[PDB]
Amino acid sequence: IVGGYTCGANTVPYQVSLNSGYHFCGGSLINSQWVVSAAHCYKSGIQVRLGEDNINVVEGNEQFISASKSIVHPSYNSNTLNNDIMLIKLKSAASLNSRVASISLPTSCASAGTQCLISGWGNTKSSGTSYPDVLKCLKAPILSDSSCKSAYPGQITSNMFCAGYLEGGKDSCQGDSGGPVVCSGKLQGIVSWGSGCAQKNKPGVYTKVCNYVSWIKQTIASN
Ligand SMILES: NC(=[NH2+])c1ccc2nc(C(=O)c3nc4ccc(C(N)=[NH2+])cc4[nH]3)[nH]c2c1
Ligand SMILES: [Ca+2]
Numbered sequence: 001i002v003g004g005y006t007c008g009a010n011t012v013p014y015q016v017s018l019n020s021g022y023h024f025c026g027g028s029l030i031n032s033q034w035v036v037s038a039a040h041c042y043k044s045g046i047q048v049r050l051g052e053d054n055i056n057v058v059e060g061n062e063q064f065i066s067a068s069k070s071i072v073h074p075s076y077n078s079n080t081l082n083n084d085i086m087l088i089k090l091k092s093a094a095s096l097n098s099r100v101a102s103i104s105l106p107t108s109c110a111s112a113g114t115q116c117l118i119s120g121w122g123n124t125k126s127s128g129t130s131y132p133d134v135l136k137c138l139k140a141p142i143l144s145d146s147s148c149k150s151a152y153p154g155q156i157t158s159n160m161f162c163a164g165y166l167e168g169g170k171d172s173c174q175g176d177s178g179g180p181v182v183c184s185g186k187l188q189g190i191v192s193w194g195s196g197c198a199q200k201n202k203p204g205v206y207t208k209v210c211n212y213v214s215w216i217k218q219t220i221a222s223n
């Protein structure tokens, strides 16, 4: 996250860190046994870490659980990144508490203007590499599809939306991937892609989760 602030230990209790010997992507807990992340975060051998704040220190509120199965969206295109969402089932169900809680899926899609909270342990420098050990947060509004499509001509589909600042300075970045974009209490986006990070007129692009609620509900109930 570039231009964000330290969230505070466990203030985003539904944030997960996907680890395959190191942190490589973020994710969101949707219920005690399932996590939603981005399909471009697919790997084999993933351990889900809940209750994290500093990912380099065991501070006492973590739960490390391995995944039993991963389901990448049936129509995910790795070249355009369209339908960039994946579900992960935990081998055991998490124990939910104040520090580990699930986030709610949306009943409708959010409007341009809506302020959201985006979080992750991704790169914090636009020009450079600096990876934080504690969770970083960023409040950014959803942008109109028009400014999103002008920034990325012929690349934005109906399954994506942009959020951020066209002036640049604030954005999600690699390492935040798969992470949550919560607006009004509902998980509305998943960190998917962008042009570098925090560049002027290059906002972040997120997966539009309101378009996948039936696929999510049907998939977890049948797995
Ligand atoms: N399994 C891997 N090897 C892997 C995992 C995540 C990656 N992520 C990128 C990436 O290239 C990438 N993830 C981004 C997320 C947000 C923005 C943004 N500017 N908002 C830009 C991003 N670029 N490469 C990746 C490779
Ligand atoms: Ca830790």
Ligand SMILES: [Mg+2]
Pocket: 025, 026, 027, 119, 120, 121, 175, 176, 177, 178, 179, 180, 191
């Ligand atoms: Mg994240």
Ligand SMILES: [Zn+2]
Pocket: 040, 173, 174, 175, 176, 177, 178, 192
């Ligand atoms: Zn990524």
